[PDB]
Structure formats: structure tokens, C-alpha cells
Design a protein around this nucleic acid. Sequence first.
RNA 1: CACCCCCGUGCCCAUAGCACUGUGGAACCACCCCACCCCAUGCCGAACUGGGUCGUGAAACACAGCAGCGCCAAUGAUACUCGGACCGCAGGGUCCCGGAAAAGUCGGUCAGCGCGGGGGUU
Length: 84
Amino acid sequence: AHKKGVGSSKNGRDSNPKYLGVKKFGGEVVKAGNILVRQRGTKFKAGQGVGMGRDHTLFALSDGKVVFINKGKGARFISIEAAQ
RNA sequence: CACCCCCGUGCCCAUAGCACUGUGGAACCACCCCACCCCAUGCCGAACUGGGUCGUGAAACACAGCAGCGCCAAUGAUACUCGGACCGCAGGGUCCCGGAAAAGUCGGUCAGCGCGGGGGUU
Ligand SMILES: [Mg+2]
Ligand SMILES: [Mg+2]
Ligand SMILES: [Mg+2]
Ligand SMILES: [Mg+2]
């Protein structure tokens, strides 16, 4: 006549969002200590003027202007060059 | 650099790599030889290290050749597609406008640009 279940899911679950990616893009002014990429790994390597926290977070060290170096795929660098 | 060549070291990060191959030796490099100590081996001077030859340039390195491989790669067309409009009950599909791949074909390539030093041009 009717049915009695009984099944469910073992799924559903997921994890709260991890707002990643670059926050500071090609040709952008930058204050000292402004963050420029959140990333899982070495996706973007620090160049001149940019350091890297343990989160592999890239944060700029001395003001200036942001510049993206794509060195042919899998090896890429972000840097600051000050204006003048 | 005056011309070559070699040693270091860079920008470049494979159209710059690998194989096959030829050349190279006292002038730089290499193997080489010795090691009780500095120094070093999870064991061994193989490697790090130390004292120095001759000998060999065979190995390795440098340079040249080469398109077998690798890598780079068109135009043409297409896929898809912003945005204009449409058909199909629906799965799905069309037209106009611009953008426009990937894979493949044409091919292209045995790299290029520096700095310093050494050593040669009866
Ligand atoms: Mg449309
Ligand atoms: Mg069209
Ligand atoms: Mg076009
Ligand atoms: Mg060669």
C-alpha cells in the first residue's frame, strides 16, 4: 500500500568556502603588506619585493606596482616595481 | 674580444632537448696518482677532502655536423560562443552579427643575447 523508508544519504557534507585566488592583479598599486594571492601551493612564486607566509600567501614588502610574470606554465612569479 | 678559442658566470627557461656522429689536448677542462694526517665515508679517497705528476684525451665536458625522435607550429575550415532573433511536446535544433579555439595539415628549428678572465694570431 505505502512504503516505510528506510534509506538515507551518507553524503551531504562539504566544507565552508575557502576564498582563494589572487586578490591583487596585474598593474595594481600596493601598500606595504597588502596581500596579492591566497593559494594552496607554489602556484605563484614570490619575485622581487614580495614575501610568502606559511599559507603560501603572497604579501608585498615595500609598496610599488604589481607585475605578473608567467614563465611558460607551472613556474610563475609576482613582483613589485615602484613607479619611476 | 682585434680575430679565434677556452674557463667561469648570467639573461633565456626545449623551435634552446636527446640520440647517432666527427673534432679537441699541454692550453684551459677532464680522467689520472698518492693519501699518515686536515676533511670524509650509516661500509670504501666511489663522493666530499687533501699533496701532485707524467700518461690519456679515449670516458666525461666543449664544439661542429644532422631533422630519426622530441619541442615549436601556419593559413583554410570547423567546434563552441557574447549579443540580436527563432523551430521543436520534448530529447534537442536553426538564422543573422561579431569574437573564435583545441587536435591535425603547412612547416619552423641541432638556439639566441651578455659579462669577466685566461690562453693563442712568423
Ligand atoms: Mg544566443
Ligand atoms: Mg559565424
Ligand atoms: Mg578572428
Ligand atoms: Mg650539439
